[PDB]
Design a protein around this ligand. Structure first.
Ligand SMILES: O=C1CCC(=O)N(O)CCCCCNC(=O)CCC(=O)N(O)CCCCCN1
Ligand SMILES: O=C1CCC(=O)N(O)CCCCCNC(=O)CCC(=O)N(O)CCCCCN1
Ligand SMILES: O=C1CCC(=O)N(O)CCCCCNC(=O)CCC(=O)N(O)CCCCCN1
Ligand SMILES: [Fe+3]
Length: 677
């Protein structure tokens, strides 16, 4: 059993029935007064999904183009909140613990994942520090109690190759002890000249039942990315328009092949202890330690040379980083009745402690011709080194009551947080030391009709430490999100279909803002995001699987000192939609064959905060072919072929500014072989 900290749903095709993302305790999606999406293991594979970021490319309210084709980090823009989008990821109930103010942001390979859960809007009441768009919860693969052995191989264009294996099963005659061990190797060239991606990772897991009342799960995850692909951008001039009559290629490398390194070693171990006391009382401890090394050498373009017609000015960034982080979550849940009301009452205490030691170097590099470049002129003019030790501590105390009474489903949550953040400029010897406490709350109400219709309303709050500091060097007040949400959910009790609509209004406060004149920030900015999401998961037969989505997002700087009080953030499409279908032939000559694909639409986005032109809209097509050769008498063998961006469209996915625009991925074609023993 054991609802606390577990999804416990069911899954069929692309549709999950339950999640714990919104509650830290298993709850049907239909009875949860929040917007929750679930991306199934099957959805990841069918779409040939290569990262967490890309796996959401079919999910409403999520923009997946912040840095275009780059795969170095998972940038998850939620409900138009692009800033700190790298810090939205949770793994097995615990904040991932990257430091978004450094290069040490972690990435979880999808091959280790069983599910991806997406919670929209402010959600600090259960998690502490987080962004106003929502958050993403990855659920790792766990030991199975029956033997499972899979081997997979993939090959593609762009020099892609990959190997994985996934073995699981019980170790004891009684099936109280089970393991899973997963490993993988991969490599890629990318559309971009002279770039490599490469990764090696292994994940051991051990599960032990001390009895029916107690389970301990032991986890390891060790990952080495000796190369980091491409993580650059080029000027809008001449990507979005011609530059002296020519266009920059989508394969252009703005760096120096002799000085382009990204080495990230991420080492994690942890455990989850599950103890049932009573049919009433349950307790859980989730724990994870992280230790990572990141090494970076990057020459990048930054604007056009003022003197040399078709050359870009270039600069150099260098970094060596060591990140350490501890996270524990202590949960105690009471399940009990009080007359007609059934209560699910949760109390928790969590603790985050992080230290990041960063030695940064920078300088000026030679200009580079943006059309027919000559590489090799790699001398750097160094700027002053900039060395820091960064520390963060977060202690949270939270309370939640899920109250079900007749057809009502209510949610009440409160959390008090103590945050301490410090930054020792180790070059200068100075230290910024700041302590804060924040109170956050959430209240939800949903009415469940007996046909599977569920209207609901939600109010929810969030906070995040401010990345900026004021006229005295003291960091500003944490930013704050507040959200009103209205929704409607529908599942016909027969069907394997599910439909939702969500209407949202998010206000974000204490955003840093200053007049262009000034060098100092004040916490007087405000941002508002409002809109509508529609999501459809259908099975119209036991062969035909559907997904669809529509997103309308109106985000605006409602208060700014910098001239921008009235503008729309860049990297924030007003309109998005997507649709994916998969058809499996199940009897007859074609049996064992599967066919699939889909299309996703992103509306225009602004290239800059100043709003001076648009990044055009784009429509991409995906397609798939699978064949289970077991149907030809070799059981456990299946093969598939995938193509994303099937029409090979050449587009800018987005721009962070007028200097930095990113290309979308060209067609990515994959062939996969899966064999179970
Ligand atoms: O370590 C760093 C920041 C991290 C970074 O920049 N990465 O690229 C790594 C990925 C983490 C976040 C994704 N990027 C952003 O959120 C854009 C940040 C931005 O606007 N800047 O100007 C840069 C910040 C100035 C200091 C530069 N040094
Ligand atoms: O140069 C720095 C510090 C180094 C750094 O932060 N790097 O990422 C490495 C080099 C950036 C190259 C372009 N990177 C992108 O366009 C992705 C977004 C991003 O990462 N930014 O930092 C946005 C601003 C980058 C310019 C200002 N800051
Ligand atoms: O304002 C700051 C700190 C805030 C920050 O880092 N932002 O990104 C603010 C978001 C608006 C700017 C969008 N992007 C760019 O201008 C490109 C690279 C970048 O991001 N820079 O900051 C380098 C610009 C120098 C600005 C001075 N430093
Ligand atoms: Fe950067």
């Amino acid at each position: 059993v054991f609802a606390l900290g577990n999804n416990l749903g069911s899954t069929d095709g692309y549709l999950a029935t339950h999640s714990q993302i919104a509650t830290k305790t298993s709850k049907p999606l239909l009875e949860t007064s929040q917007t929750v999406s679930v991306i199934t293991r099957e959805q990841i594979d069918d779409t040939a999904s290569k990262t967490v970021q890309q796996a959401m490319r079919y999910t409403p309210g999520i923009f997946t183009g912040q840095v275009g084709a780059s795969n170095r980090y998972d940038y998850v823009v939620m409900r138009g909140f692009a800033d700190n989008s790298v810090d939205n990821i949770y793994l097995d109930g615990l904040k991932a613990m990257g430091d978004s103010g450094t290069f040490s942001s972690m990435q979880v390979d999808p091959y280790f994942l069983e599910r991806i859960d997406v919670l929209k809007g402010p959600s600090s009441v259960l998690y502490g520090r987080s962004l106003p768009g929502g958050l993403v919860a990855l659920t790792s693969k766990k030991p199975l109690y029956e033997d499972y052995r899979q081997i997979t191989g993939s090959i593609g264009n762009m020099g892609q190759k990959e190997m994985g294996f996934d073995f699981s099963g019980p170790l004891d005659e009684e099936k109280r002890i089970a393991y899973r061990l997963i490993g993988l190797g991969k490599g890629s060239d990318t559309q971009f000249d002279h770039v490599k991606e490469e990764r090696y990772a292994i994940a051991p897991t051990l599960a032990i039942d001390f009895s029916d009342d107690t389970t301990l799960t032991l986890q390891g995850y060790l990952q080495h990315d000796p190369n980091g692909g491409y993580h650059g951008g080029v000027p809008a001039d001449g990507t979005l328009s011609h530059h002296n009559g020519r266009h920059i290629s989508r394969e252009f490398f703005d760096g120096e092949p002799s000085k382009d390194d990204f080495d990230r070693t991420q080492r994690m171990f942890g455990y989850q202890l599950e103890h049932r006391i009573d049919d009433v009382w349950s307790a859980r401890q989730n724990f994870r330690y992280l230790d990572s090394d990141v090494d970076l050498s990057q020459v990048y373009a930054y604007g056009w040379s003022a003197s040399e017609p078709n050359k870009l000015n270039r600069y150099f960034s260098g970094a060596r980083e060591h990140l350490q982080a501890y996270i524990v979550d202590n949960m105690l849940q009471a399940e009990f009745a009080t007359g007609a009301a059934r209560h699910t009452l949760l109390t928790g205490l969590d603790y985050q402690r992080r230290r990041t030691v960063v030695d940064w170097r920078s300088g000026s590099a030679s200009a580079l011709d943006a059309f027919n470049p000559v590489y090799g002129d790699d001398a750097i003019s160094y700027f002053p080194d900039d060395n820091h030790t960064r520390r963060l501590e977060q202690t949270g105390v939270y309370l939640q009551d899920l109250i079900d009474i007749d057809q009502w489903r209510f949610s009440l949550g409160l959390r008090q947080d103590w945050v301490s953040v410090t930054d020792k400029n180790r070059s200068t010897g100075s230290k910024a030391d700041d302590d804060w406490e924040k109170f956050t709350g959430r209240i939800g109400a949903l009415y469940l009709f007996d046909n599977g219709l569920a209207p609901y309303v939600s109010y929810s709050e969030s906070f995040n430490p401010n990345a900026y500091s004021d006229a005295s060097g003291t960091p500003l007040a944490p930013t704050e999100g507040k959200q009103w949400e209205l929704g409607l959910k529908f599942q016909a009790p027969g069907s394997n279909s599910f439909y939702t609509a969500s209407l949202f209004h998010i206000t974000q406060e204490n955003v840093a803002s200053k007049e262009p004149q000034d060098n100092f920030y004040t916490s007087v900015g405000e941002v508002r995001s409002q809109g509508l999401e529609l999501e459809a998961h259908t099975q119209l037969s036991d062969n035909l699987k559907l997904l669809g989505s529509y997103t309308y997002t109106d985000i605006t700087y409602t208060k700014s000192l910098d001239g921008n009080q009235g503008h729309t953030p860049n990297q924030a499409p007003k309109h998005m939609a997507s649709l994916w279908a998969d058809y499996a032939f199940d009897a007859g000559p074609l049996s064992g064959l599967s066919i699939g694909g889909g299309a996703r639409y992103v509306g225009e986005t602004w290239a800059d905060k100043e709003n001076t032109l648009r990044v055009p809209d784009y429509t991409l097509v995906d397609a798939r072919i699978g064949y289970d050769l077991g149907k030809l008498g070799l059981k456990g063998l299946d093969v598939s072929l995938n193509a994303n961006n099937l029409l090979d469209k050449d587009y800018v996915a987005s721009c962070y500014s007028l200097d930095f625009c990113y290309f979308g991925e060209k067609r990515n074609v994959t062939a996969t072989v899966n064999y179970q023993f």
